[PDB]
Paper text:
We found the Fabs to bind simultaneously at distinct sites on the trimer, with a majority of images revealing three P2G3 Fabs bound to either up- or down-RBD conformations and one P5C3 Fab bound to an up-RBD. To characterize the P2G3 paratope and epitope interface in detail, we performed local refinement of the P2G3 Fab-RBD interacting region and reached a resolution of 3.84 Å with well-defined density, allowing clear interpretation of sidechain positions. The interactions are mediated through electrostatic and hydrophobic contacts and involve 16 residues of the RBD, mainly bound by the heavy chain of the P2G3 mAb. The interactions between P2G3 and the Omicron RBD are conserved in both RBD-up and RBD-down states. CDRH2 extends the epitope by interacting with R346 that is engaged by residue W53 via a potential cation-pi interaction, an interaction that is probably conserved with the R346K spike substitution.
To provide additional therapies against Omicron, we isolated a mAb named P2G3 from a previously infected vaccinated donor and showed that it has picomolar-range neutralizing activity against Omicron BA.1, BA.1.1, BA.2 and all other variants tested. Despite the exceptional neutralization profile of P2G3 against currently circulating variants, development of resistance is inevitable when a virus is under selective pressure. We report here that P5C3, a previously described potent and broadly active neutralizing mAb that acts by blocking the spike-ACE2 interaction, not only targets a highly conserved region of the RBD but can also bind Omicron spike concomitantly with P2G3. Apart from the in vitro neutralization activity, P2G3 alone and/or in combination with P5C3 confers an excellent in vivo protection in the SARS-CoV-2 Omicron non-human primate (NHP) challenge model in both the prophylactic and therapeutic settings.
Residue numbers in the entry:
A (entry chain B): 1 to 228
B (entry chain F): 1 to 221
C (entry chain C): 1 to 214
D (entry chain A), F (entry chain D): 330 to 530
E (entry chain E): 1 to 215
The structure:
């Protein structure tokens, strides 16, 4: 079996260099060409770098040219990508893909064959920040056809572990978990709501659980219909 | 025998391009090199570049760039040079020089040299030359010597030949090199000195020949 | 470099249908193209190279063709496993760049969206910012636009839009739009509303919440 | 005669890359049974000019050992590879001996060894002081002193690099298109000839 | 850019003498990568010295080469009539290849007074709409001469063309033709035309003058 | 035995050209008197090893009939003309019977059978079904299919041309020099006694 293992990812403050390592198993390392391809969230794909059999034909994308360095070692079957002068564009998931024709584009037969699972690299100057929980109080405007929608709004959390459950996991019907959205302030936010019958308001308890492992903050918030 | 032969003279219009050929015979061409040098009339030699026959690698001078190309052919054993953007400054004689090679050894110096190809770039067209008689007179007499002659003017193709009495008189005959005038046509003079006792005795004729225009004029003076 | 474009961005499809995707370049790239399929949160896998030569272990439903500056991929019969994202890659020059991507979609019938709005909470107001959220739910055509107006004046440039993936139960879509405003800027206005324009309803819904009314 | 231990003829042929003509690869094959039929399993136009032996009567008789060499060359060079013919590549790179008893397989590889920009992974020698003895390997990269005056290890006039690369592009014609060549040279020694061919029934 | 320079502008001497010709380089070059070429007018140049220390086939030992670094020298032991030509030294090792200015070796005897003639324009040229006045000098040993054109006692410049003949093989004489061309009306509105020479062979400058009223 | 007309023993040996080895000619000589001296007198004769008959008793004895043959043989393969010996030429071109009673002769023909570019008038066979019958004439030129593919005349591989031409060059070695070969097969029936040699009355 052919397998690729990537390591070295994580979080890097701007102005700090890093090195990403890729190891291979199941094929001749020094007879096949390899490429590094990065992908931003919901942004398709974009080629980054490629290398050849004997380190003769190497080239970088103009967007990242002059800041990245590719190297290959057949003694231990390793591929290194050294990063320099990191900026806000470098946060992405990286794949260490293998080519099937000992060389870059130009030959009649060419194709990216084996794609690794990739590693995640985040670039920012920030630090842990416990999330804040706000109540989304149901009201008449939230009632439609006997069903009332209520939820919570998680905000201001730099790392990206998020687990949201209703009634400590007892309630899981009608709940939508929207993906996180990066604001202009650099802090990610998300909102989750659950649909419950309008007549059930005030008689059934709602438990909003949030979790943030790096900030070790777990806040439970009570949300009740507004009082007029 | 080791010999080098170039192409014939070339006449071109400004803004056009010129191809010059140079073939070699009598030695191992595939293990030699070709050096191209062009020279103006009475000026300094300059270098244009050189190509290696073995691998086709070429080198060009910084002054002559983006307009010079060099190619070669083993089957015809001939090298060729291409010059673009022709102008009045490209009128010169081109030479191809090679180091001769008897067998597997080659001389360290460039021995074989071509006969040279004359390239002229001008917008003027071929036209017959005009003859002007510088006839003998008292103003041309000083101490028994009278100088007369013929002037050949207003001709575009440079090669023009002047003779005196179909070669009868050669002593004291001096033809002068042509000069390019502002009109774009050349002009030259031929002068002969004779004793003052011989004037008015036998007719003086100068014959001017212009091969490109096929003009032959016999002028009495 | 070389620019690649795919005309139909989103294609709703069902089982047994016929689907064709066209990827075209600017300069003639001969036949050095390939197609990749990326699943939901998985590494993409190669399907076809040179647009005609199947590589290995690929079902016969996939097929392709191409000449000059035109390249078309086709699937004879569709299965639930084939719903994914599709990319086309050129290989003529060295600076290789992919396309914008094409993703197949399931087929429902139009669904009328439900709209909800949440007035800002007192605790969120105490933080110094005011956020109003307009909710869209259970709509099959994902193509929709939400408009924010305050005091009957259109508000733009300060709202963010978020949409979730298609559900596996009803196969619909849910969208959440949030407008961010500071606390000091909140009270100078009197009417806050969100507008929804969608194919589900003939006319756009106009619903607002009064700041001064409980 | 279960017929199980076949010769590894796939590695020589089904190879991603072939060695350069100036530095070819040598592989020995022994203790197995030949499967020459596989020879015509692929390639549209593949010549088999077997000199010294019957081209179609090779399976029956047993040989001591077989040697396999391979490289990549141009169009006319496959004609020049014939034994006894004189050519620059012939007398500077391989130099097949006159008393040769073996086969030569040359097939087009334009689809697999052509680059749009131009391949640079193939090199070939231009000139050498003396001709090559048969079955000799030269990988020297020293400068060439064509004249009597020493070059002192610097390039320039009368001092040239000995290796020139090809330039394989699809726009070129058949003559300049790449071709892959593999040569099998059979041997007979005091060994019990463990390279016996296949047996039927 | 390796620039070369030849110090001797001319090498006028007599047959049977010894001549030294030195050409200098701006920077050092390869030790044995210099050549020496001989060229005659109207003919292709021929190599004389190759390898900066040796001699090519067919060249007598009278020509010898020496020097190194930035300066090279060439010695002619015995002078011969066929040795008077133009000599060039060029480089061989550096990436650019250049040539020197070129030194012309000539023969000089004794200074002599040249014969001077003047011709106002012929009637045929006057009928042709132009007028050319020609001042001719013959039999002067030194190459350099100075001729000045005076029309109506006013200096004229920018309209004179000069043609010179090479060395004469029988008495080593030189020729010189200075032609001044003018339009019909411009030539006619002036009267006096003269050419004055201050040739160093002549003890004092001599002028030849005529008037259009007597032509 | 009367009648003393001389046999035409000069046309076969002294001929402008000889046919190919595959297409050999047979001349029946009868009703004349033999003259064996001319055969070994004029032409320098090598390898005159007669089979079954002493060469010194050719004159006195009377025979039944005589057949004359002539062809051109590769110098190294000159030993192929011998009973009991196999080879490509013997198996495909021309073979001698085991019960052979006659003579064989061969001589170099570099002056007449060598061209500056190479001889193309000589043709031989590379392979066939199996061994041929003694004294057999083959004119077959159809292509053979080694495999099961009916190429019906044209094929890059799996079909080979049975006819192959030689190439003779003056700069060849002694072993490469073609030899003109003449074989005489005789009969000892002695019933008609029509080819008696020179005898008195
Ligand atoms: C190099 O590898 C390729 C791919 O594996 C080989 O291509 C195929 O090789 C087989 C050899 O068995 C050729 O014959 C086929 O065999 C199967 C066996 O069941 C048979 O069912 C088929 O009908 C066919 O006869 C096959 O034609 C060939 N493919 C093509 C497109 O030509 C290739 O032979 C290998 N080269 C070697 C081993 O030298
Ligand atoms: C010898 O080699 C043959 C190759 O054909 C092998 O095949 C066996 O054939 C017999 C005949 O019926 C089967 O019963 C066996 O099952 C075959 N072997 C296998 C592994 O399936 C076999 O290795 C040998 N043949 C015998 C008869 O032993």
């Amino acid at each position: 079996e052919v397998q690729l293992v990537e390591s070295g990812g994580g979080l890097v403050q701007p102005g700090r260099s890093l090195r990403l390592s890729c190891a291979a198993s199941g094929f001749r390392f020094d007879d096949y060409a390899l490429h590094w391809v990065r992908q931003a969230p919901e942004k398709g794909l974009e080629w980054v770098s490629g290398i050849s059999w004997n380190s003769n034909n190497i080239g970088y994308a103009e967007s990242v040219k002059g800041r990245f360095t590719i190297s290959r070692d057949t003694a231990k079957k390793s591929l290194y990508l050294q990063m320099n002068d990191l900026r806000a564009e470098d946060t992405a998931l990286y794949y260490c893909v293998k080519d099937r024709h000992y060389d870059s584009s130009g030959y009649f037969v060419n194709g990216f064959d084996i794609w690794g699972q990739g590693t995640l690299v985040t670039v920012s100057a920030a630090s842990t920040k416990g999330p804040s929980v706000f109540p989304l109080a149901p009201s008449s405007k939230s009632t439609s056809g006997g069903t009332a929608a209520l939820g919570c709004l998680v905000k201001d959390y730099f790392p990206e572990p998020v687990t949201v459950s209703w009634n400590s996991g007892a309630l899981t019907s009608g709940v939508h978990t929207f993906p996180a959205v990066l604001q202009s302030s650099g802090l990610y936010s998300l909102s989750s709501v659950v649909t419950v019958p309008s007549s059930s308001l005030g008689t059934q308890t709602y438990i909003c659980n949030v979790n943030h492992k790096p900030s070790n903050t777990k806040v439970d918030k009570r949300v009740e219909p507004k009082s007029c | 025998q080791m010999q080098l032969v170039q192409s014939g003279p070339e006449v071109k219009k400004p803004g056009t391009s010129v191809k010059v050929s140079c073939k070699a015979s009598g030695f191992t061409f595939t293990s030699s090199a070709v050096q191209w040098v062009r020279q103006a009339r009475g000026q300094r030699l300059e270098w244009i570049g050189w190509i290696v026959v073995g691998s086709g690698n070429t080198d060009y001078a910084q002054q002559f760039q983006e307009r010079v190309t060099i190619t070669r052919d083993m089957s015809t054993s001939t090298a060729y040079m291409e010059l673009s953007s022709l102008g009045s400054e490209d009128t010169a004689v081109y030479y191809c020089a090679a180091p001769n090679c008897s067998g597997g050894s080659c001389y360290d110096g460039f021995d074989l040299w071509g006969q040279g190809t004359m390239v002229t770039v001008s917008s003027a067209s071929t036209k017959g030359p005009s003859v002007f008689p510088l006839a003998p007179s008292s103003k041309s007499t000083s101490g028994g010597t009278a100088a007369l002659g013929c002037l050949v003017k207003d001709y575009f193709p440079e090669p023009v030949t002047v003779s005196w009495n179909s070669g009868a008189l050669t002593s004291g005959v001096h033809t002068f090199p042509a000069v390019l005038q502002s009109s774009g046509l050349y002009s030259l003079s031929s002068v002969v000195t004779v004793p003052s006792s011989s004037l008015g005795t036998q007719t003086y004729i100068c014959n001017v020949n212009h091969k490109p225009s096929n003009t032959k004029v016999d002028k009495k003076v | 470099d070389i620019q690649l474009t795919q005309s139909p961005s989103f294609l709703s499809a069902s089982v047994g249908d016929r689907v064709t995707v066209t990827c075209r370049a600017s300069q003639g790239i001969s036949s050095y193209v390939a197609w990749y399929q990326q699943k939901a949160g998985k590494a993409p896998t190669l399907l076809i190279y040179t647009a005609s030569t199947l590589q290995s272990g690929v079902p016969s439903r996939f097929s392709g063709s191409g000449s000059g500056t035109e390249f078309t991929l086709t699937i004879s019969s569709l299965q639930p496993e084939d719903f994914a994202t599709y990319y086309c890659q050129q290989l003529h020059s060295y600076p290789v760049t992919f396309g914008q991507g094409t993703r197949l979609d399931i087929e429902r019938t139009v669904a009328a969206p439900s709209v909800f709005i949440f007035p800002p909470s007192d605790e969120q107001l105490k933080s110094g910012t005011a956020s109003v959220v307009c909710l869209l739910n259970n709509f099959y055509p994902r193509e929709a636009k939400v408009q924010w107006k305050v005091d009957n004046a259109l508000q733009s440039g300060n709202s963010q839009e978020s949409v979730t993936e298609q559900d596996s139960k009803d196969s619909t879509y849910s969208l959440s739009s949030t407008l961010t405003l500071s606390k000091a800027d909140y009270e100078k206005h009197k009417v806050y509303a969100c507008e929804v324009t969608h194919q589900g309803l003939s006319s756009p819904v106009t619903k607002s919440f009064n700041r001064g009314e409980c | 005669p279960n017929i199980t231990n076949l010769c590894p003829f796939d590695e020589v042929f089904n190879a991603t890359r072939f060695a350069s003509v100036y530095a070819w690869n040598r592989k020995r094959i022994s203790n197995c049974v030949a499967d020459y039929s596989v020879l015509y399993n692929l390639a549209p136009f593949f010549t088999f000019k077997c000199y010294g032996v019957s081209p179609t009567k090779l399976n029956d008789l047993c040989f001591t050992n077989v040697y396999a060499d391979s490289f990549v060359i141009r169009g006319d060079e496959v004609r020049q590879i014939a034994p006894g013919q004189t050519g620059n590549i012939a007398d500077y790179n391989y130099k097949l001996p006159d008393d040769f008893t073996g086969c030569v397989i040359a097939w087009n590889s334009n689809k697999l060894d052509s680059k749009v920009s131009g391949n640079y992974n193939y090199l070939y020698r231009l000139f050498r002081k003396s001709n090559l003895k048969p079955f000799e390997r030269d990988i020297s990269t020293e400068i060439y002193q064509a004249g009597n005056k020493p070059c002192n290890g610097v390039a320039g006039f009368n001092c040239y690099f000995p290796l020139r690369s090809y330039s394989f592009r699809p726009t070129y014609g058949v003559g300049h298109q790449p071709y892959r060549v593999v040569v099998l040279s059979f041997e007979l020694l005091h060994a019990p000839a463990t390279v016996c061919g296949p047996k039927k029934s």
